Design a protein around this ligand. Structure first.
Ligand SMILES: [Zn+2]
Ligand SMILES: [Zn+2]
Lengths: 9, 49, 107, 116, 151
């Protein structure tokens, strides 16, 4: 799975 | 050509209150932006308002 | 527009309905590469313009060595009407112009 | 030394010896192109060099305000105005010989009276 | 050799060869000249950036929206807790003879049903469901026991 939270630059 | 003289005042710069505060403010603002994102991430994950 | 590579299976015959070889037919066409000033390049490169109107005329001395550009009276008397086209390189080599557009994807 | 460069790929040429004629040939280490040498000199090392004494001379050297003026006679046009400067070599072994540039013919002469 | 190169075909055509490189320079004797020079001077003269804006209102008024203020925030942005906390509904345990049959039909549809999906379909409290679920199914995801599955 994923971290369900990420930041796009 | 002769090696560049390190003491040449034309190669020196004086940082006044303006530039000194600029780098200080830039560092502090960067920290503020990081804190903002952490609160946003925490609210989404922990399901708060 | 991603596509296979070596294409040993001959998939381009049906995926694309046009020849993939660049058209080497219009290459025998003289072209002048001109760098324009900021004021002139700002109004000639706009895509909200260029409808095919006559922007001016080019005058070449019978003996050569001197070229000049004469714009029309459509500039609103705000910019010079005469320019001197300076040939920075009389002979230009190894420079070419090529076009680029997509291919038909069906059949 | 008159460094020579390749003609097909512009790479640096190198000297090679051919025994079929006992002559000198210049060959490329990458594209296999040959060229007959013009001179038998291939390496030159200069312990004491006078190259660069007049480095920096341009067509508008006289426009420099810092450069001093002099009243010496130019021995090619018989003029009195000129700008002079010392050698541009920074080694601590060069003499204080002056170099004069004439503002009328751009001729460079020297005040040396020992060797000239 | 390599069997894949992953090319990207495109339609191209050579539509001319460059013969002259030119630089257009306005004539210095042109009547409209000395206007471009003024335009060029205006390039460096222009100051697009503007000074920071100073608030001339009373300091006590500008600070009325900062810190612990009587005004309450009326924003709906990122109210994640509000979005899901609003949805809440209870249920009641139904008779065994009916829910028990429902579970067997549900298992027949799929052989591995999750708890969340099971509750959504049954729409009944987990308490009663747990009693029947253990008697019929086993957890490794719950699955029907081999006593009934092997039929
Ligand atoms: Zn070569
Ligand atoms: Zn002279």
């Amino acid at each position: 799975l994923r971290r369900k939270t990420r930041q796009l630059k | 050509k002769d090696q560049d003289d390190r003491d040449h005042f034309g190669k020196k710069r004086l940082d006044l209150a303006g530039p000194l505060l600029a780098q200080l403010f830039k560092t502090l603002f960067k920290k503020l932006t990081k804190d903002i994102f952490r609160y946003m991430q925490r609210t989404v994950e922990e399901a708060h308002d | 527009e991603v596509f296979d590579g070596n294409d040993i299976e001959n998939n381009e015959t049906k995926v694309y309905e046009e020849s993939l070889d660049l058209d080497l037919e219009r290459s025998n066409r003289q072209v002048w590469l001109v760098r324009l000033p900021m004021f002139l390049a700002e109004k000639w490169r706009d895509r909200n313009n260029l409808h095919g109107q006559e922007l001016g005329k080019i005058r070449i001395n019978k003996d050569g060595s001197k070229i000049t550009l004469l714009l029309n009276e459509n500039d609103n008397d705000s910019i010079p009407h005469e320019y001197d086209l300076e040939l920075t390189k009389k002979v230009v080599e190894n420079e070419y112009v090529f076009t680029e557009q997509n291919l038909k994807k069906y059949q | 030394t008159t460094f020579r460069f390749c003609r097909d790929c512009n790479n640096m040429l190198y000297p090679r010896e051919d025994k079929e004629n006992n002559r000198l040939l210049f060959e490329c280490r990458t594209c296999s192109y040959v060229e007959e040498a013009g001179s038998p000199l291939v390496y030159r090392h200069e312990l004491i060099t006078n190259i660069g004494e007049t480095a920096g001379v341009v067509q508008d050297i006289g426009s420099d305000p810092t450069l001093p003026r002099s009243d010496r006679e130019c021995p090619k046009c018989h003029s009195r105005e000129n700008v002079f400067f010392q050698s541009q070599q920074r080694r601590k072994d060069t003499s204080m010989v002056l170099f004069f540039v004439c503002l009328s013919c751009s001729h460079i002469f020297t005040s040396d009276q020992k060797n000239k | 050799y390599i069997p894949y190169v992953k090319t990207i075909p495109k339609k191209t055509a050579i539509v001319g060869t460059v013969c002259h490189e030119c630089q257009v320079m306005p004539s210095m004797n042109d009547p409209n000249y000395h206007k471009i020079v003024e335009q060029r001077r205006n390039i460096v003269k222009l100051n697009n950036k503007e000074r920071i804006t100073t608030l001339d209102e009373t300091v006590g008024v500008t600070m009325s929206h900062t810190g612990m203020s009587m005004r309450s925030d009326n924003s709906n942005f990122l109210k994640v807790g509000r979005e899901k906390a609003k949805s809440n509904i209870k249920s009641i345990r139904m008779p065994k003879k009916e829910i028990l049959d429902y579970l067997f039909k549900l298992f027949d549809e799929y052989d591995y049903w999750s708890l969340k999906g099971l509750k959504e379909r049954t729409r009944q409290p987990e308490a009663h469901l747990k009693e029947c679920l253990d008697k019929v199914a086993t957890l490794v995801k719950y699955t029907l026991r081999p006593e009934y599955k092997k039929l």
